[PDB]
């Protein structure tokens, strides 16, 4: 299936911590992905014969910025794609990918941002997770902080990853405190807060926009992993998460037959539905990705090996693994990304290299 068709290296020689294909490409335009590393974001276009065409970068004013993460959305009025980036400065930048202008930025975390994710039905709802232990939900249409997910019952150390479920009714987050926490955003309070955030125009009122303080997860566990949890993804109602213990665990809150929407905050059980082991991934901040349909899952390890799991099987534990190696690919792979149509997989590395694999 996948064959390695090209690679390159970016000129800064620092880790590429993130990669994302733009899944909002217009019909008939070439496939495009963004990489983030050092103080820059760079866009590339995929062409035939494995060509990876360099386009243009956004380079931060601060030489000490270090971007960690990026996420694509689009402008909800014009349809044009937008790219959000963030990293150690704790500043979210919204980038026009065509000109690479910083259209606007958001501050509040003040503290490093480890991940950004956009809501799967509302292109304006951006979630950030921070070294300051909180998540924040932003509305990038009205430029409002809708809610802060924190408090002593929230995360007690850096939050490293988070994912919305299929309809963006709830969020699972995870971090350095070894726990995975659920935060429901379809509550009456949260739905109202979002609606109010769309009604907010500071030119038409005197009040500041009030943010929700959400201090209580809807479920919490520390029973899945025994070290920093660095990546989490919903799979329907189940969860896929990993730590730096050479495993992705597939699990769910509660007991085997418990409905996710009936789980109470005080739920003390989880169910393990399978575990996908692999090797040489004991460093933290190593993220897996899935294709658009959630048929497959790719993870790179710290010596440049790729694992891909076929999840198109009746139960999670029946996943079929294949691996992808190249003799010149030896640096740690921080993240992978599939093109929308699943024909291309990209891996980015700690030595600033980019690896292209075609189906």
């Amino acid at each position: 299936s996948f064959k390695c068709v090209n690679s390159l290296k970016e000129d800064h020689n620092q880790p590429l911590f993130g990669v994302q294909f733009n899944w909002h490409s217009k019909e008939g335009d070439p496939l495009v992905f963004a990489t983030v590393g050092s103080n820059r974001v760079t866009l590339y276009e995929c062409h035939s014969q494995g060509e990876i065409r360099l386009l243009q970068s956004y380079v931060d004013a601060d030489a000490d910025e270090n971007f960690y993460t990026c996420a694509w959305t689009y402008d909800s009025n014009t349809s044009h794609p937008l790219l959000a980036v963030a990293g150690s400065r704790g500043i979210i930048r919204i980038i026009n990918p065509i000109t690479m202008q910083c259209i606007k930025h958001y501050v509040g975390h003040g503290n490093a941002i480890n991940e950004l994710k956009f809501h799967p039905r509302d292109p304006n709802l951006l979630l950030s997770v921070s070294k300051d232990h909180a998540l924040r939900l932003w509305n990038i249409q009205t430029d409002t902080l809708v809610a802060i997910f924190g408090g002593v019952e929230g995360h007690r150390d850096e939050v490293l990853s988070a994912d919305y479920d299929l309809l963006g009714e709830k969020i699972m987050s995870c971090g350095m405190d070894h726990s995975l926490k659920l935060w429901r955003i379809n509550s009456k309070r949260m739905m109202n807060a979002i609606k109010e955030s769309y009604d907010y125009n500071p030119n038409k009122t005197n009040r500041p926009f009030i943010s929700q303080k959400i201090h209580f997860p809807d479920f919490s566990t520390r029973d899945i992993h025994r070290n920093y949890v660095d990546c989490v993804r919903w799979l329907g109602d189940l969860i896929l998460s990993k730590s730096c213990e050479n495993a992705i665990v597939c699990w769910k809150p509660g007991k085997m037959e418990d409905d996710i929407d009936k789980i109470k905050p005080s739920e003390s059980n989880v169910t393990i539905l399978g575990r996908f082991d692999y090797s040489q991934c004991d460093i933290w901040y190593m993220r897996f990705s899935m294709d658009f349909w959630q048929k497959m899952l790719a993870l790179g390890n710290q010596v440049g090996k790729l694992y891909v799991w076929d999840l198109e099987v009746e139960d999670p534990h029946k996943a079929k693994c294949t691996t992808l190696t190249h003799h010149k690919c030896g640096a740690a792979i921080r993240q992978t990304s599939f093109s929308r149509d699943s024909s291309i997989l990209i891996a980015v590395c700690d030595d600033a290299s980019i690896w292209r694999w075609d189906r």
């Binding site: 880790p15 070290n227 920093y228 730096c244 004991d282 460093i283 933290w284 901040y285 710290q302 740690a332 700690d350």
Partner: peptide, 5 residues
């Protein structure tokens, strides 16, 4: 736990 090798 190391972020890097």
């Amino acid at each position: 736990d190391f972020k890097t090798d």
